[PDB]
Symmetry: C3
């Protein structure tokens, strides 16, 4: 006879964890919150900013259990980070919902380990959608809530009444770190993408259309004589880019994506930066007051990720990423006074093996690194040659 959530919580809370962290760059200790995604695999998620540069990470459950977890992919652009659990047993995944069919007035609840306070749930509603702009350079399309959030809730969950996930508590706004009743979370849908990506590549393959633009406000719609106070304005398409080929002109405006009306440029950015190269999609334009529908596909780009620190833990130096197919790891760029290179390391090299163990990708690598060889045998190859590098 008393409306409550506890009923559903019983069912959902389990699918959430309190994350405890140790790392270095000086030694540090932190904490956040994570969410089970695949019950069997033990796939938890979290704000990258909670796990960034993490040496040891342990996960604690709703029911007291402590597990050890490992990095599986970071994307500090949108601040997500998939991690996995060592020996996942008897877990509880979570159902996801469609962040897209959200409405402003719906209610939401957020759980997390704020201030190391164990499973802490709070309540609120959708304050507003598609908010962005804190760190303009990041892919942000936050949902905004009045639910109560703080240090700890980071990577925590935020669900509809049905105990279905819709976004992740990322950051809040607050002078003097304290909840004013304004929290932000990353829409489920976005996360799903960034997720299933790393799930299969240990990293993010960023698709771009190859365009420039800026927020269409009212003044602009005036100057450029169109009907639309919100939207994405096409500054200047790129040549030989998806956009180019697609047939889009500088001075056009986009009103929708895959049927989904577009609040503003910021979102559009985050929306697609989210998606994986080759991802097909359909757009609604409006050049010269005339509506347009066009199809497209994300192409390559020229991005940056995974460093010689995010895998070596200490061995600064060149950036590193996969190569061709499962053809090993390529050293992007060795610095100057960097220890990696002070091991014989030089850009362009192409690690193919180690400790009599073939390497096809960062996975097989950090995997050998896990065995923690006291002595480290690199089987790389400069130019047409074959050599080895060493370590301790």
């Amino acid at each position: 006879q008393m409306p409550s959530l506890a009923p559903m919580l019983e069912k959902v809370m389990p699918s959430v964890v309190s994350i405890n962290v140790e790392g270095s760059t000086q030694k540090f200790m932190a904490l956040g919150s994570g969410v089970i995604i695949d019950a069997d695999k033990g796939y938890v998620v979290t704000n990258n900013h909670v796990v960034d540069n993490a040496t040891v990470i342990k996960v604690q459950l709703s029911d007291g259990r402590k597990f050890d977890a490992k990095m599986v992919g970071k994307d500090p652009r949108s601040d997500i980070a998939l991690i996995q659990i060592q020996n996942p047993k008897n877990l509880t995944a979570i159902k996801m919902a469609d962040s897209d069919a959200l409405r402003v007035g719906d209610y939401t609840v957020a759980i997390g380990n704020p201030f190391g306070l164990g499973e802490t749930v709070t309540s609120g509603i959708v304050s507003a959608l598609g908010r962005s702009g804190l760190n303009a350079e990041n892919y942000e399309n936050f949902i905004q809530t009045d639910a109560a959030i703080n240090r700890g809730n980071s990577g925590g969950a935020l669900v509809n009444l049905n105990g279905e996930l819709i976004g992740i508590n990322t950051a809040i706004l607050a002078p003097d770190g304290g909840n004013i009743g304004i929290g932000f979370a990353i829409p489920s849908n976005m996360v799903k993408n960034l997720t299933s990506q790393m799930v299969e590549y240990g990293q993010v393959k960023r698709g771009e259309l190859g365009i420039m633009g800026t927020e269409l406000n009212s003044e602009l719609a005036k100057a450029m004589k169109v009907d639309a106070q919100r939207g994405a304005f096409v500054s200047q398409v790129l040549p030989n880019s998806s956009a180019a080929k697609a047939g889009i002109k500088a001075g056009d405006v986009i009103t929708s994506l895959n049927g989904k009306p577009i609040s503003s440029f910021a979102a559009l950015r985050a929306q697609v930066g989210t998606m994986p190269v080759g991802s097909k999609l359909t757009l609604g334009l409006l050049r010269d007051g005339k509506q347009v529908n066009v199809n497209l596909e994300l192409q390559q780009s020229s991005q940056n990720q995974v460093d010689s620190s995010s895998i070596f833990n200490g061995i600064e130096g060149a950036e590193m990423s996969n190569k061709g197919k499962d053809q090993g790891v390529v050293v992007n760029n060795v610095k100057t006074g960097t220890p990696a290179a002070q091991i014989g390391l030089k850009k362009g090299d192409v690690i193919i093996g180690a400790n009599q163990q073939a390497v096809k990708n960062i996975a097989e690598l950090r995997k050998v690194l896990d065995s923690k060889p006291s002595v480290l045998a690199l089987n790389i190859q400069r130019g047409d040659s074959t050599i080895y590098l060493l370590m301790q």
Copy 2:
């Protein structure tokens, strides 16, 4: 199958705006929130304190549109301020509800542009009613809510579930400007009055009964042997005042107004200061343990408003207000080292015309001021004479 507000929001949010301000007294920029009242006229409202001394004010909509607005009446006593929109097209007014039939336990939602965050809605309930006292001298009878409010929400809305208005987010309590979960808003009813007033006069015509008093607490009820721990105590009626004539004695207590029980004096004040001269009303007393019912009518007073700055924008000097019927604007009081007077201005004068354009009231005036004559031709009249004053 999921209870939500979004349904109604769809319908209401539109009737709300984000207010952006530029003024001077040194140049400044601010922001607040406003609410459409008359869909056709383009009548928005806001805390006076958000628009006070405003040079240029633009209004942005729920749907991206930007409009220009103009002052139409300020009442910094209760801090409301009606403004209108230049070229109102396709607008959305809002339905008002009866702030009087409110109850403490009802739910409420507040929207506004806090921190310039675009349409931001938050949720809560009626924390309590008839709260007052922040600035004792103001007419305050706030409703109090735990809904989330901040800089920006000022002039924002606060509605029952039905999307009917009940009060305006004015101020919150907070050390270190931040929402602790205590917000205040001015009851609809109050606002309605202050509103439809300016609607027809560009100003406020304050009625008074002509009495003095103070909060009847428990101790007092003791000393003066009555049964009532809350109420308004009649210190000393005034002679030839409504109260006088009505027949009220010093040492009486008021328990109700127009049937509406009275929490305390503070409210009673705000309640009536709210109302326009001549407004009829009925009261419930209690002199010598004996209940009383009496009728009355607000009379004149001796108040202050609309300055030579609120209309001149820069030209300090005498205060100014209407005169008799549509008989022009009267200079209340020229200071000493004030530029207005350093134009030939002197108290008692009675501007009757300007630029071959008759003037009957502040409206017709600020209206000519809008045409922004480079050179300003005043057709005033000292004593029985007729003269002109000038400007640039």
Copy 3:
């Protein structure tokens, strides 16, 4: 047609008060909130920390009435404090609910006089249960809510929708004293006990089992090869203690109390420290992976309470408590440079009478103290003798 709480509030709010305080240790003034427990007796409650060292305490009602109240028992260990009202007339008690059958997801509302703001109600849900640890030494098993709470709400109420009590707003977490959306309250059940105790003894009779232990986390369950990530670990039973007799071994873990599963040690502590000596109860163990059920009974201990200040108001010196049956008050321990002793006071003494008025317990005492004799006639007895001490 609009869901609300006001309906029930109408009925409940009355059962709550705004507490105003004057005391010394330098003169001070404070405020909190209290709750009527017994409508006829006028039994209000509050955080001890709100009333501690109180000289004069007045209570104000939901309906404006002011009453005078008196101390009736303090327990600064769990921070509750029963007080009574002088001449209780036409009061409103409150129904209590079972804090034990609570669930995390249920909604709650909290009322109180925050910042001296008169009856202020706010809303939220059960953020989480059995939280402890702020002041480890206190008996804490708080319920945690996102409802809005602040200075003033202390001793305020916190109820289920039905207007049934479930806990008392004690403290909140907050850097820069301000509600972040994290409040804590003491479960009803706990309070009931501490309550009906003082109701009949003016003090707390602490039962102990006589054991030591510490929080069973995961690591521990490893080391000691058991299945249970939460619980109370039995460090070392005491000899001739309830536990001893009961038959409990060091290295056992408790999983439940009176059927009620046990979150952690902290709770268990608060739970039982709560209860009165001789209180019977049943436990669920788990030594060597094998479940156990045992019965028990709280015994005596060696605690501390009620000082020569909490009753004398100024007369520091020895601690004081009851003795045997209604056999008067015993001086626990006189200090050195303490005024009480500088009246002829010495430990071991046994006040039996005063002003030709027999004394059997602290009650009959503070009762004579209430008559406020200008001159104070003590009828004590050192060893086998009979003497008198004096005062002014």
